[PDB]
Protein backbone atom coordinates (compact mmCIF):
# COMPACT_ATOMS: atom_id res chain seq x y z
CA UNK A 1 0.00 0.00 0.00
CA UNK A 2 1.30 3.41 1.12
CA UNK A 3 3.71 4.74 3.76
CA UNK A 4 1.96 5.91 6.92
CA UNK A 5 3.30 7.92 9.90
CA UNK A 6 2.30 8.52 13.48
CA UNK A 7 1.57 4.86 14.31
CA UNK A 8 3.99 4.89 17.27
CA UNK A 9 2.54 7.56 19.47
CA UNK A 10 4.13 7.36 22.93
CA UNK A 11 7.27 6.24 24.69
CA UNK A 12 5.68 4.60 27.77
CA UNK A 13 8.67 3.15 29.64
CA UNK A 14 12.42 2.59 29.27
CA UNK A 15 13.74 0.22 31.91
CA UNK A 16 17.03 -1.65 32.32
CA UNK A 17 17.33 -5.40 32.95
CA UNK A 18 20.99 -6.27 33.58
CA UNK A 19 21.77 -8.90 30.96
CA UNK A 20 24.85 -10.12 32.81
CA UNK A 21 26.43 -8.84 36.05
CA UNK A 22 27.27 -5.37 34.80
CA UNK A 23 28.33 -2.95 37.53
CA UNK A 24 26.64 0.07 36.04
CA UNK A 25 23.37 0.83 34.29
CA UNK A 26 24.99 2.23 31.13
CA UNK A 27 23.25 2.98 27.81
CA UNK A 28 25.44 0.39 26.02
CA UNK A 29 25.15 -2.32 28.67
CA UNK A 30 22.29 -4.62 27.68
CA UNK A 31 19.32 -4.74 28.02
CA UNK A 32 17.10 -1.65 27.85
CA UNK A 33 13.46 -2.58 27.32
CA UNK A 34 11.71 0.22 25.47
CA UNK A 35 7.95 0.01 25.66
CA UNK A 36 6.16 2.06 23.01
CA UNK A 37 2.49 2.81 22.61
CA UNK A 38 1.03 2.46 19.01
CA UNK A 39 -2.30 2.68 17.27
CA UNK A 40 -3.72 1.45 14.01
CA UNK A 41 -7.14 2.21 12.59
CA UNK A 42 -8.59 0.11 9.66
CA UNK A 43 -10.39 3.23 8.43
CA UNK A 44 -6.99 4.81 7.86
CA UNK A 45 -4.67 1.85 7.32
CA UNK A 46 -4.85 -1.18 5.12
CA UNK A 47 -3.22 -4.56 5.09
CA UNK A 48 0.13 -4.19 3.32
CA UNK A 49 0.77 -0.52 4.22
CA UNK A 50 4.17 0.13 5.77
CA UNK A 51 5.63 2.40 8.41
CA UNK A 52 9.07 2.90 9.96
CA UNK A 53 10.25 3.70 13.49
CA UNK A 54 13.56 5.59 13.58
CA UNK A 55 15.69 5.03 16.73
CA UNK A 56 18.63 7.47 17.06
CA UNK A 57 21.52 6.30 19.23
CA UNK A 58 20.49 2.62 19.20
CA UNK A 59 23.32 0.15 18.26
CA UNK A 60 21.45 -3.21 18.22
CA UNK A 61 18.60 -5.30 19.48
CA UNK A 62 19.70 -7.70 22.17
CA UNK A 63 17.72 -10.69 20.90
CA UNK A 64 18.14 -13.31 18.24
CA UNK A 65 14.60 -12.58 17.01
CA UNK A 66 14.52 -10.83 13.56
CA UNK A 67 11.07 -9.26 14.00
CA UNK A 68 8.42 -8.37 16.53
CA UNK A 69 4.66 -8.31 16.29
CA UNK A 70 2.27 -5.43 17.01
CA UNK A 71 -0.48 -7.22 18.90
CA UNK A 72 -3.45 -5.86 20.85
CA UNK A 73 -6.28 -7.54 22.73
CA UNK A 74 -4.78 -10.80 21.57
CA UNK A 75 -4.75 -10.05 17.79
CA UNK A 76 -1.68 -9.49 15.65
CA UNK A 77 -2.08 -6.33 13.54
CA UNK A 78 1.43 -5.68 12.17
CA UNK A 79 4.87 -7.31 11.81
CA UNK A 80 7.99 -5.24 12.28
CA UNK A 81 11.44 -6.16 11.07
CA UNK A 82 14.47 -5.15 13.22
CA UNK A 83 17.42 -3.40 11.57
CA UNK A 84 20.35 -2.72 13.89
CA UNK A 85 22.48 0.32 13.04
CA UNK A 86 25.63 -1.31 14.45
CA UNK A 87 28.73 0.26 12.75
CA UNK A 88 26.79 1.18 9.60
CA UNK A 89 24.62 3.99 10.84
CA UNK A 90 24.07 5.97 14.06
CA UNK A 91 20.40 4.81 14.42
CA UNK A 92 18.39 1.62 14.28
CA UNK A 93 15.02 1.04 12.61
CA UNK A 94 11.82 -0.97 12.67
CA UNK A 95 10.17 -1.50 9.30
CA UNK A 96 6.55 -2.56 9.81
CA UNK A 97 3.80 -4.02 7.53
CA UNK A 98 0.08 -3.92 8.46
CA UNK A 99 -1.46 -7.42 8.68
CA UNK A 100 -4.67 -8.65 7.06
CA UNK A 101 -6.32 -8.67 10.48
CA UNK A 102 -6.64 -4.91 10.24
CA UNK A 103 -9.95 -5.25 8.51
CA UNK A 104 -11.79 -1.93 8.08
CA UNK A 105 -13.76 -1.92 11.32
CA UNK A 106 -10.73 -2.52 13.61
CA UNK A 107 -9.37 0.21 15.90
CA UNK A 108 -6.29 -1.14 17.65
CA UNK A 109 -4.34 0.47 20.53
CA UNK A 110 -1.43 -1.49 21.93
CA UNK A 111 2.14 -1.50 23.11
CA UNK A 112 5.32 -3.26 22.06
CA UNK A 113 8.58 -3.94 23.86
CA UNK A 114 11.99 -3.63 22.13
CA UNK A 115 15.18 -5.04 23.74
CA UNK A 116 17.93 -2.49 23.04
CA UNK A 117 21.52 -1.53 23.51
CA UNK A 118 22.28 2.14 22.91
CA UNK A 119 25.39 3.34 21.11
CA UNK A 120 27.40 5.78 23.18
CA UNK A 121 30.68 5.02 21.43
CA UNK A 122 33.36 2.44 21.42
CA UNK A 123 35.70 2.98 18.44
CA UNK A 124 37.04 5.74 16.30
CA UNK A 125 34.51 5.13 13.53
CA UNK A 126 32.42 8.10 12.33
CA UNK A 127 29.29 6.34 13.61
CA UNK A 128 30.73 5.74 17.12
CA UNK A 129 32.26 9.22 17.41
CA UNK A 130 28.91 10.73 16.46
CA UNK A 131 26.97 8.62 19.00
CA UNK A 132 29.62 9.25 21.70
CA UNK A 133 27.78 12.61 22.16
CA UNK A 134 24.26 11.09 22.49
CA UNK A 135 24.08 10.98 26.33
CA UNK A 136 25.74 11.88 29.64
CA UNK A 137 25.56 10.42 33.06
CA UNK A 138 22.32 11.22 34.87
CA UNK A 139 18.96 12.26 33.40
CA UNK A 140 18.67 12.17 29.60
CA UNK A 141 15.88 12.50 27.09
CA UNK A 142 15.62 9.59 24.61
CA UNK A 143 13.62 10.37 21.45
CA UNK A 144 12.40 8.05 18.65
CA UNK A 145 10.19 8.97 15.70
CA UNK A 146 7.88 7.48 13.14
CA UNK A 147 8.43 10.31 10.57
CA UNK A 148 7.00 13.47 12.11
CA UNK A 149 5.76 12.50 15.53
CA UNK A 150 8.82 12.65 17.95
CA UNK A 151 8.16 10.43 21.02
CA UNK A 152 10.32 10.99 24.07
CA UNK A 153 11.01 9.74 27.55
CA UNK A 154 13.45 10.71 30.33
CA UNK A 155 15.73 8.09 31.72
CA UNK A 156 18.56 7.86 34.22
CA UNK A 157 21.90 6.47 32.97
CA UNK A 158 24.85 5.58 35.19
CA UNK A 159 28.42 6.42 34.12
CA UNK A 160 30.97 3.65 33.89
CA UNK A 161 32.44 2.69 37.24
CA UNK A 162 35.89 2.37 35.78
CA UNK A 163 38.36 5.10 36.78
CA UNK A 164 39.08 7.00 33.54
CA UNK A 165 42.70 7.78 34.47
CA UNK A 166 43.97 4.22 33.91
CA UNK A 167 44.09 2.22 30.71
CA UNK A 168 40.66 1.57 29.22
CA UNK A 169 39.21 -1.24 27.19
CA UNK A 170 35.95 -2.24 25.46
CA UNK A 171 34.62 -5.24 23.55
CA UNK A 172 31.29 -4.98 21.77
CA UNK A 173 29.75 -7.73 19.66
CA UNK A 174 28.64 -6.79 16.15
CA UNK A 175 25.96 -9.49 15.57
CA UNK A 176 25.54 -9.15 11.78
CA UNK A 177 29.28 -9.67 11.29
CA UNK A 178 30.02 -12.22 14.02
CA UNK A 179 32.91 -9.94 14.95
CA UNK A 180 33.68 -7.96 18.11
CA UNK A 181 35.05 -4.40 18.10
CA UNK A 182 37.76 -4.02 20.70
CA UNK A 183 39.30 -0.80 22.07
CA UNK A 184 42.39 0.18 24.00
CA UNK A 185 42.98 3.69 25.41
CA UNK A 186 46.35 4.50 27.04
CA UNK A 187 46.53 5.56 30.70
CA UNK A 188 46.15 9.28 31.12
CA UNK A 189 49.19 11.64 30.89
CA UNK A 190 47.38 14.88 31.58
CA UNK A 191 50.23 17.10 30.34
CA UNK A 192 50.73 15.05 27.17
CA UNK A 193 52.91 12.12 26.14
CA UNK A 194 56.55 12.13 25.10
CA UNK A 195 56.19 8.61 23.69
CA UNK A 196 54.56 5.22 24.17
CA UNK A 197 53.76 1.81 22.69
CA UNK A 198 50.32 0.22 22.90
CA UNK A 199 48.18 -2.41 21.25
CA UNK A 200 46.68 -5.86 21.58
CA UNK A 201 47.10 -9.37 20.24
CA UNK A 202 45.86 -12.87 19.89
CA UNK A 203 47.25 -14.90 22.78
CA UNK A 204 46.40 -18.57 22.19
CA UNK A 205 45.57 -18.88 18.49
CA UNK A 206 41.80 -18.43 18.68
CA UNK A 207 41.71 -14.69 17.84
CA UNK A 208 42.22 -12.82 14.54
CA UNK A 209 42.52 -9.04 14.20
CA UNK A 210 40.77 -7.66 11.08
CA UNK A 211 43.34 -5.17 9.72
CA UNK A 212 40.71 -3.73 7.35
CA UNK A 213 38.61 -2.42 10.29
CA UNK A 214 40.98 -0.53 12.55
CA UNK A 215 41.31 2.99 13.95
CA UNK A 216 44.28 4.77 15.47
CA UNK A 217 43.71 8.23 16.88
CA UNK A 218 44.00 10.75 19.67
CA UNK A 219 40.81 11.77 21.39
CA UNK A 220 40.21 15.10 23.17
CA UNK A 221 39.05 13.48 26.39
CA UNK A 222 36.42 10.79 26.82
CA UNK A 223 32.67 10.57 27.50
CA UNK A 224 30.96 9.20 30.63
CA UNK A 225 31.52 5.63 29.39
CA UNK A 226 35.23 6.12 28.77
CA UNK A 227 34.88 6.19 24.96
CA UNK A 228 36.63 8.45 22.47
CA UNK A 229 34.76 11.58 21.46
CA UNK A 230 37.16 12.64 18.66
CA UNK A 231 39.86 11.16 16.55
CA UNK A 232 42.74 13.29 15.24
CA UNK A 233 45.88 12.27 13.45
CA UNK A 234 49.18 12.30 15.31
CA UNK A 235 52.73 11.01 15.08
CA UNK A 236 52.81 7.17 15.18
CA UNK A 237 53.90 4.03 13.48
CA UNK A 238 51.83 0.89 13.35
CA UNK A 239 52.13 -2.81 12.65
CA UNK A 240 49.01 -4.81 11.91
CA UNK A 241 48.53 -8.51 11.20
CA UNK A 242 45.88 -11.05 12.07
CA UNK A 243 47.89 -11.77 15.21
CA UNK A 244 47.70 -8.18 16.59
CA UNK A 245 47.86 -4.42 16.17
CA UNK A 246 50.53 -2.27 17.82
CA UNK A 247 51.52 1.34 17.66
CA UNK A 248 54.46 3.39 18.79
CA UNK A 249 53.83 7.11 19.10
CA UNK A 250 55.34 10.44 20.10
CA UNK A 251 54.41 13.96 21.18
CA UNK A 252 50.71 13.66 22.01
CA UNK A 253 49.51 17.08 23.28
CA UNK A 254 48.06 17.84 26.68
CA UNK A 255 44.38 16.97 26.92
CA UNK A 256 44.53 14.14 24.36
CA UNK A 257 44.61 10.34 24.84
CA UNK A 258 45.92 7.87 22.19
CA UNK A 259 43.69 4.89 21.34
CA UNK A 260 43.64 1.90 19.02
CA UNK A 261 40.65 -0.25 18.04
CA UNK A 262 40.02 -3.13 15.71
CA UNK A 263 37.43 -5.65 14.76
CA UNK A 264 38.35 -9.12 15.88
CA UNK A 265 37.12 -12.63 15.10
CA UNK A 266 37.35 -15.42 17.66
CA UNK A 267 36.76 -19.19 17.64
CA UNK A 268 34.32 -18.38 20.47
CA UNK A 269 33.33 -14.68 20.68
CA UNK A 270 31.98 -15.49 24.17
CA UNK A 271 35.36 -16.61 25.60
CA UNK A 272 38.80 -15.27 24.47
CA UNK A 273 41.96 -13.72 25.89
CA UNK A 274 43.79 -10.65 24.52
CA UNK A 275 47.39 -9.63 25.37
CA UNK A 276 48.08 -5.86 25.64
CA UNK A 277 51.26 -3.81 25.19
CA UNK A 278 51.21 -0.85 27.54
CA UNK A 279 54.20 1.49 27.80
CA UNK A 280 54.14 5.26 28.02
CA UNK A 281 56.20 8.29 29.06
CA UNK A 282 54.34 11.39 30.11
CA UNK A 283 55.62 14.89 29.34
CA UNK A 284 57.56 15.53 32.48
CA UNK A 285 59.11 12.10 32.54
CA UNK A 286 56.84 9.72 34.44
CA UNK A 287 57.11 6.26 32.75
CA UNK A 288 55.43 2.91 33.04
CA UNK A 289 55.79 -0.36 31.17
CA UNK A 290 52.93 -2.57 32.28
CA UNK A 291 51.71 -5.17 29.78
CA UNK A 292 48.75 -7.31 30.79
CA UNK A 293 46.20 -9.82 29.59
CA UNK A 294 42.41 -9.77 29.80
CA UNK A 295 39.86 -12.57 29.68
CA UNK A 296 36.73 -11.54 27.80
CA UNK A 297 33.43 -13.34 28.37
CA UNK A 298 29.92 -13.16 26.85
CA UNK A 299 28.49 -15.92 29.06
Amino acid sequence: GKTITGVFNSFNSLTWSNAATYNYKGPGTPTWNAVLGWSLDGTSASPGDTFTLNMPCVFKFTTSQTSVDLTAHGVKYATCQFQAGEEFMTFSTLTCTVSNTLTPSIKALGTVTLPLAFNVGGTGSSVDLEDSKCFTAGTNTVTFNDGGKKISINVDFERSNVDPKGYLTDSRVIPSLNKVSTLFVAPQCANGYTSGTMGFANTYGDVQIDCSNIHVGITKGLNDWNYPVSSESFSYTKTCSSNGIFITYKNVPAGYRPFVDAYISATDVNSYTLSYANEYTCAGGYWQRAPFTLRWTGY
Binding site: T29, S171, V173, L294, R295, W296, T297, G298
Partner: peptide
Amino acid sequence: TTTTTTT
Protein backbone atom coordinates in the same frame (compact mmCIF):
# COMPACT_ATOMS: atom_id res chain seq x y z
CA THR B 1 38.40 -16.04 37.52
CA THR B 2 38.57 -12.26 36.87
CA THR B 3 36.98 -11.58 33.49
CA THR B 4 35.45 -8.61 31.71
CA THR B 5 32.03 -9.02 30.10
CA THR B 6 31.52 -8.00 26.52
CA THR B 7 28.60 -5.82 25.39
